[PDB]
RNA sequence: ACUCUGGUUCCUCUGCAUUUAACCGUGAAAAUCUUUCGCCUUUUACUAAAGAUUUCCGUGCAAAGGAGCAUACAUUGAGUAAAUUUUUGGAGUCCCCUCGAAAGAGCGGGA
């Protein structure tokens, strides 16, 4: 879900057509395990 | 750590992120706790080394879920004595006179044990007893931190102080006299109260389709766990099976479950409660020959003894090292 | 929403900041713009009113009707939105 | 997560995610999808109450 | 493919163990048998054993259950994927969207129904939607034969 | 109002496809070197693992040129088309006191 907010606020943010980007799973073990292991913050400006 | 997958990540970071050295890893275990399942039959006294003061204590099983309330800070020993006393008399229906007389939680300010002052003020004056109060609390917290069976923390014991001869003058009631002696009194009350071990239990939620339910019980049965609810997931084909399993028997539970179901089952596990290890840990009729997994009545004897071997303690509790014989 | 001109959009982003506005009768109100509207009705919290003689008062809330506002001073950072 | 949030005195709010799984995997008729969504909201409010 | 996937075969090869039905390789480290050290850290008298740490668990959690993993190229497998629940339709005559009887009914016996704060009273029942407003795909059929 | 271009399909050249968790390749070869295992009276051809490099069958995109087919000017980068309370169809004008040569200005006052 955060991948969508990233994609909306970052024009160059790439989501694969067939795999989740998981921008906030920044650790390589989170990339490999496929689950979020540690919390990652993301500050963005967004319009209501 | 909290579970298998937690340690796998903690150790991964130890290997690949932080330490970059070879580490031996032991087989996983759990910390046990110690409890008494019965009311202390004798009342147990401990004379201070100077042979002047005479502490007396008893031990009891602590009533259901009061330890969860203490540990979750639903009640706090730092509250004002009316508010503190109000909690015990309102929620647990305690006598108001008892509720005034709590002296500590232990082994820390949120620990699952209570010390009470059951000393009636005719037998010793409340002021003199108040002079040694802080030493008695500190030896009780020492006792409950180590505990007499296998030096694992005591839990869910209600210790009542109920008598105290105390010397008239400070040099005969010093902290170094009282603090070791309250430990010996707590330990003698403990070992009279029918001691037992406690192990932590997970609560397991399994989501699996209908045909995998018989596998779930089969994998639980090998690990002493049991199913407490088996309900369909609404608007789904899967079912939800809820179960308690010992943490000590949960290592590889998730892996066993997924393999015997081809990953059609998956499960997740959280700590839920402390429950007695079965059997009597002090039963010397049981010998722990290490050839095989012990049958379930011997577990308390095994877990105690091997925890003593691990910690570098003597093989067996010399229970009479604390008691007086005509106690 | 449906499109509306940039000045009104910027006014909605001026919400929550301090603003100053002068009314057609000349009084200057400084306050925190708690609400704006597409007709630029304004609710100011925490308001200070300044009369043309230079006296002043605090006012806890003010609603000013949109077609009675002469101009506003928005905050500076809104030039980046 | 809901209970721990209330204990920590956080404002609990709800997103019912992965709603495509009703359409595409479960294939519930739209009427039965509404009941599935409603029950999730009911389950959550059962916790809050 | 839990424990029968590419990463679990890599971990098995690295640990010099074999999955039942997996491939078997020449030992990557030739002398991992040297755990016959008789040191007290491994002492069978001190360890409590409940279910034996069989090699599936060594592969499933490579780092909690193994030594030397800085020199061994052990690999994490993907932990879990939320199980897909698509049931194949048997009958072409069924609607594309139908409540399959393998899906459990949407009920729970003891939930309170949530309070629906619907608009009420005489002025509010008269609220009408304009005559052109219409669902966003009203004339499209919900499903086709495709 | 300015300059900017015909669609398609194919050929060929050039450049780029390293911050790899992972993937130019949802497939999968061969060699060399170094090392360690097994064959063995030697070498070749080998066993089967590691590490480092190569070759080979392939891949993507951009850009340029050409070659065939049937044929269309728009359109990209730069930039077009509401008199009834909250803005764009008038609550507008005029007249005294004050400072000041001079013309404005007061929540000034009056029709
Ligand atoms: N059908 C469907 N699947 C989704 C959707 N969003 C995510 N998923 C899938 O669900 C899985 C989990 O997605 P994640 O984004 O990793 O969810 P997550 O909660 O952050 O996982 P953790 O943080 O580790 O608990 C992946 O396999 C996703 O492909 C969705 O919107 N619809
Ligand atoms: Mg020769």
Short mmCIF file of N, CA and C in Angstrom, two decimals, chain C:
data_model
loop_
_atom_site.label_atom_id
_atom_site.label_comp_id
_atom_site.label_asym_id
_atom_site.label_seq_id
_atom_site.Cartn_x
_atom_site.Cartn_y
_atom_site.Cartn_z
N UNK C 1 -11.25 17.43 -6.51
CA UNK C 1 -12.44 18.24 -6.88
C UNK C 1 -12.35 18.76 -8.32
N UNK C 2 -13.42 19.39 -8.77
CA UNK C 2 -13.40 20.16 -10.01
C UNK C 2 -12.39 21.30 -9.90
N UNK C 3 -11.86 21.70 -11.05
CA UNK C 3 -10.80 22.69 -11.10
C UNK C 3 -11.30 24.05 -10.62
N UNK C 4 -10.44 24.74 -9.88
CA UNK C 4 -10.67 26.10 -9.42
C UNK C 4 -9.32 26.79 -9.49
N UNK C 5 -9.34 28.11 -9.65
CA UNK C 5 -8.11 28.83 -9.94
C UNK C 5 -7.10 28.74 -8.82
N UNK C 6 -5.83 28.85 -9.20
CA UNK C 6 -4.68 28.72 -8.31
C UNK C 6 -4.77 29.60 -7.08
N UNK C 7 -5.19 30.87 -7.17
CA UNK C 7 -5.33 31.66 -5.95
C UNK C 7 -6.20 31.05 -4.88
N UNK C 8 -7.28 30.36 -5.25
CA UNK C 8 -8.11 29.72 -4.24
C UNK C 8 -7.44 28.47 -3.71
N UNK C 9 -6.80 27.69 -4.58
CA UNK C 9 -6.04 26.53 -4.11
C UNK C 9 -4.95 26.93 -3.13
N UNK C 10 -4.22 28.00 -3.43
CA UNK C 10 -3.18 28.46 -2.52
C UNK C 10 -3.78 28.93 -1.21
N UNK C 11 -4.96 29.53 -1.26
CA UNK C 11 -5.65 29.90 -0.03
C UNK C 11 -5.98 28.69 0.83
N UNK C 12 -6.43 27.59 0.22
CA UNK C 12 -6.64 26.39 1.01
C UNK C 12 -5.35 25.84 1.59
N UNK C 13 -4.21 26.05 0.93
CA UNK C 13 -2.95 25.67 1.54
C UNK C 13 -2.46 26.69 2.55
N UNK C 14 -3.02 27.90 2.55
CA UNK C 14 -2.71 28.84 3.61
C UNK C 14 -3.40 28.48 4.91
N UNK C 15 -4.40 27.59 4.88
CA UNK C 15 -5.01 27.09 6.11
C UNK C 15 -3.96 26.53 7.05
N UNK C 16 -4.20 26.69 8.34
CA UNK C 16 -3.28 26.24 9.36
C UNK C 16 -2.07 27.11 9.58
N UNK C 17 -1.76 28.05 8.68
CA UNK C 17 -0.72 29.03 8.90
C UNK C 17 -1.31 30.32 9.44
N UNK C 18 -0.45 31.18 9.95
CA UNK C 18 -0.86 32.55 10.20
C UNK C 18 -1.14 33.26 8.89
N UNK C 19 -2.17 34.11 8.89
CA UNK C 19 -2.43 35.01 7.78
C UNK C 19 -2.80 36.36 8.37
N UNK C 20 -2.74 37.37 7.52
CA UNK C 20 -3.26 38.69 7.82
C UNK C 20 -4.20 39.06 6.68
N UNK C 21 -5.35 39.63 7.00
CA UNK C 21 -6.27 40.09 5.98
C UNK C 21 -6.86 41.42 6.39
N UNK C 22 -7.07 42.28 5.40
CA UNK C 22 -7.73 43.56 5.57
C UNK C 22 -9.12 43.49 4.97
N UNK C 23 -10.11 43.96 5.72
CA UNK C 23 -11.50 44.03 5.28
C UNK C 23 -11.77 45.36 4.61
N UNK C 24 -12.87 45.40 3.85
CA UNK C 24 -13.21 46.59 3.09
C UNK C 24 -13.46 47.80 3.99
N UNK C 25 -13.83 47.58 5.25
CA UNK C 25 -13.94 48.70 6.18
C UNK C 25 -12.60 49.16 6.73
N UNK C 26 -11.50 48.46 6.44
CA UNK C 26 -10.17 48.92 6.76
C UNK C 26 -9.49 48.20 7.90
N UNK C 27 -10.24 47.53 8.78
CA UNK C 27 -9.61 46.81 9.87
C UNK C 27 -8.73 45.68 9.35
N UNK C 28 -7.61 45.47 10.03
CA UNK C 28 -6.64 44.42 9.72
C UNK C 28 -6.75 43.35 10.79
N UNK C 29 -7.00 42.12 10.36
CA UNK C 29 -7.08 40.97 11.25
C UNK C 29 -5.89 40.07 10.96
N UNK C 30 -5.10 39.79 11.99
CA UNK C 30 -4.06 38.77 11.94
C UNK C 30 -4.50 37.58 12.76
N UNK C 31 -4.34 36.39 12.20
CA UNK C 31 -4.77 35.21 12.91
C UNK C 31 -4.30 33.98 12.19
N UNK C 32 -4.77 32.84 12.67
CA UNK C 32 -4.44 31.54 12.10
C UNK C 32 -5.65 31.06 11.31
N UNK C 33 -5.47 30.88 10.02
CA UNK C 33 -6.59 30.59 9.12
C UNK C 33 -7.05 29.16 9.33
N UNK C 34 -8.07 28.96 10.15
CA UNK C 34 -8.48 27.60 10.47
C UNK C 34 -9.32 26.99 9.37
N UNK C 35 -10.03 27.80 8.58
CA UNK C 35 -10.79 27.32 7.44
C UNK C 35 -10.79 28.37 6.35
N UNK C 36 -10.88 27.90 5.11
CA UNK C 36 -11.15 28.75 3.97
C UNK C 36 -12.22 28.07 3.13
N UNK C 37 -12.80 28.83 2.21
CA UNK C 37 -13.85 28.33 1.34
C UNK C 37 -13.56 28.81 -0.07
N UNK C 38 -14.21 28.19 -1.05
CA UNK C 38 -13.96 28.59 -2.42
C UNK C 38 -14.44 30.00 -2.73
N UNK C 39 -15.39 30.51 -1.97
CA UNK C 39 -15.77 31.92 -2.00
C UNK C 39 -14.89 32.77 -1.10
N UNK C 40 -13.88 32.17 -0.47
CA UNK C 40 -12.90 32.81 0.40
C UNK C 40 -13.51 33.50 1.62
N UNK C 41 -14.65 33.01 2.09
CA UNK C 41 -14.97 33.14 3.51
C UNK C 41 -13.80 32.62 4.33
N UNK C 42 -13.50 33.28 5.43
CA UNK C 42 -12.35 32.92 6.26
C UNK C 42 -12.76 32.85 7.71
N UNK C 43 -12.34 31.78 8.38
CA UNK C 43 -12.38 31.66 9.82
C UNK C 43 -10.97 31.81 10.34
N UNK C 44 -10.75 32.79 11.21
CA UNK C 44 -9.45 33.02 11.83
C UNK C 44 -9.58 32.63 13.29
N UNK C 45 -8.74 31.71 13.74
CA UNK C 45 -8.58 31.50 15.16
C UNK C 45 -7.52 32.46 15.68
N UNK C 46 -7.45 32.56 17.00
CA UNK C 46 -6.33 33.19 17.71
C UNK C 46 -6.09 34.63 17.23
N UNK C 47 -7.16 35.34 16.95
CA UNK C 47 -7.06 36.50 16.08
C UNK C 47 -6.61 37.72 16.88
N UNK C 48 -5.84 38.58 16.21
CA UNK C 48 -5.60 39.94 16.65
C UNK C 48 -6.22 40.85 15.61
N UNK C 49 -7.07 41.76 16.04
CA UNK C 49 -7.66 42.78 15.18
C UNK C 49 -6.92 44.08 15.39
N UNK C 50 -6.64 44.78 14.30
CA UNK C 50 -6.03 46.10 14.35
C UNK C 50 -6.95 47.08 13.63
N UNK C 51 -7.39 48.11 14.35
CA UNK C 51 -8.22 49.13 13.77
C UNK C 51 -7.35 50.15 13.05
N UNK C 52 -7.98 50.96 12.21
CA UNK C 52 -7.19 51.90 11.42
C UNK C 52 -6.54 52.97 12.28
N UNK C 53 -7.05 53.22 13.48
CA UNK C 53 -6.38 54.12 14.41
C UNK C 53 -5.18 53.49 15.11
N UNK C 54 -4.91 52.20 14.90
CA UNK C 54 -3.77 51.54 15.49
C UNK C 54 -4.03 50.83 16.80
N UNK C 55 -5.20 50.99 17.40
CA UNK C 55 -5.58 50.19 18.55
C UNK C 55 -5.70 48.72 18.15
N UNK C 56 -5.85 47.85 19.15
CA UNK C 56 -5.98 46.44 18.85
C UNK C 56 -6.73 45.71 19.95
N UNK C 57 -7.20 44.52 19.61
CA UNK C 57 -7.75 43.56 20.55
C UNK C 57 -7.35 42.17 20.12
N UNK C 58 -7.35 41.25 21.08
CA UNK C 58 -7.45 39.84 20.75
C UNK C 58 -8.91 39.44 20.58
N UNK C 59 -9.13 38.51 19.67
CA UNK C 59 -10.43 37.90 19.42
C UNK C 59 -10.21 36.40 19.32
N UNK C 60 -11.09 35.63 19.94
CA UNK C 60 -10.88 34.19 20.00
C UNK C 60 -11.18 33.52 18.67
N UNK C 61 -12.26 33.92 18.00
CA UNK C 61 -12.51 33.51 16.63
C UNK C 61 -13.13 34.67 15.88
N UNK C 62 -12.90 34.70 14.58
CA UNK C 62 -13.60 35.61 13.69
C UNK C 62 -13.97 34.83 12.45
N UNK C 63 -15.18 35.05 11.96
CA UNK C 63 -15.56 34.69 10.61
C UNK C 63 -15.70 35.99 9.85
N UNK C 64 -15.02 36.09 8.72
CA UNK C 64 -15.11 37.23 7.82
C UNK C 64 -15.73 36.74 6.52
N UNK C 65 -16.72 37.47 6.03
CA UNK C 65 -17.37 37.07 4.80
C UNK C 65 -16.44 37.34 3.63
N UNK C 66 -16.44 36.39 2.69
CA UNK C 66 -15.47 36.39 1.61
C UNK C 66 -15.46 37.65 0.77
N UNK C 67 -16.62 38.12 0.35
CA UNK C 67 -16.69 39.34 -0.45
C UNK C 67 -16.49 40.62 0.35
N UNK C 68 -16.08 40.54 1.62
CA UNK C 68 -15.69 41.68 2.41
C UNK C 68 -14.19 41.73 2.68
N UNK C 69 -13.41 40.82 2.10
CA UNK C 69 -11.96 40.80 2.27
C UNK C 69 -11.35 41.61 1.13
N UNK C 70 -10.45 42.52 1.49
CA UNK C 70 -9.79 43.36 0.51
C UNK C 70 -8.56 42.66 -0.07
N UNK C 71 -7.70 42.13 0.78
CA UNK C 71 -6.57 41.32 0.37
C UNK C 71 -6.13 40.51 1.58
N UNK C 72 -5.34 39.48 1.34
CA UNK C 72 -4.67 38.75 2.40
C UNK C 72 -3.17 38.81 2.21
N UNK C 73 -2.45 38.68 3.31
CA UNK C 73 -1.04 38.31 3.30
C UNK C 73 -0.93 36.86 3.73
N UNK C 74 -0.59 36.00 2.80
CA UNK C 74 -0.35 34.60 3.09
C UNK C 74 1.05 34.45 3.66
N UNK C 75 1.42 33.27 4.15
CA UNK C 75 2.82 33.03 4.51
C UNK C 75 3.69 32.77 3.30
N UNK C 76 5.00 32.86 3.52
CA UNK C 76 5.95 32.83 2.41
C UNK C 76 6.10 31.45 1.79
N UNK C 77 6.07 30.38 2.59
CA UNK C 77 6.47 29.09 2.04
C UNK C 77 5.53 28.56 0.98
N UNK C 78 4.32 29.09 0.87
CA UNK C 78 3.37 28.57 -0.10
C UNK C 78 3.81 28.75 -1.54
N UNK C 79 4.81 29.58 -1.81
CA UNK C 79 5.41 29.64 -3.14
C UNK C 79 6.13 28.38 -3.62
N UNK C 80 6.15 27.30 -2.84
CA UNK C 80 6.78 26.05 -3.23
C UNK C 80 5.81 24.90 -3.44
N UNK C 81 4.51 25.10 -3.29
CA UNK C 81 3.59 23.96 -3.24
C UNK C 81 3.33 23.36 -4.62
#
